[PDB]
Amino acid sequence: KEAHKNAVIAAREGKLAELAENVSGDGKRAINYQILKNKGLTPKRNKDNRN
């Protein structure tokens, strides 16, 4: 039972580890794509209408 507990908590701290790697080391907090583009709530749209 405790081995299963160590396995699941290891998976959780691993996921938080990839999140800590994904966050940037640079001091400046840059705007992200969602705030930059401001697409809003949009439906799924076909690729054919792009061109």
């Binding site: 401001n38 809003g40 709530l41 949009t42």
Partner: protein, 103 residues
């Protein structure tokens, strides 16, 4: 409908039918608005229940004509107007999450 104008400006007095139980009914979407240039009190449609959270008391709103194309089953005939903007920001953009209300 309005005197010589396509759109009118008003102050939201109250939201009628918020104590009604059925979501997205016309009674749920009715809003009473007092027009600025006359002081006349008219009922308008907020387009959705989602926009009814954005509409609040004593805000300025821009009203246009409603313009039904066909007779729906559950609509309220007689309400002739719809709310287009609130606090200078369009209700559709607020609903689609492209803007925030300035207050």
């Amino acid at each position: 409908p309005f005197g010589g104008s396509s759109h009118a400006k008003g102050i939201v007095l109250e939201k009628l039918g918020i104590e009604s139980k059925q979501p997205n009914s016309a009674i749920r979407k009715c809003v009473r608005v007092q027009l600025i240039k006359n002081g006349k009190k008219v009922t308008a449609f907020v387009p959705n229940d989602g926009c009814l959270n954005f509409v609040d008391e004593n805000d300025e709103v821009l009203l246009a004509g409603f313009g039904r194309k066909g007779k729906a089953k559950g609509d309220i005939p007689g309400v002739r107007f719809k709310v287009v903007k609130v606090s200078g920001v369009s209700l559709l953009a607020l609903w689609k999450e492209k803007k925030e209300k300035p207050r």
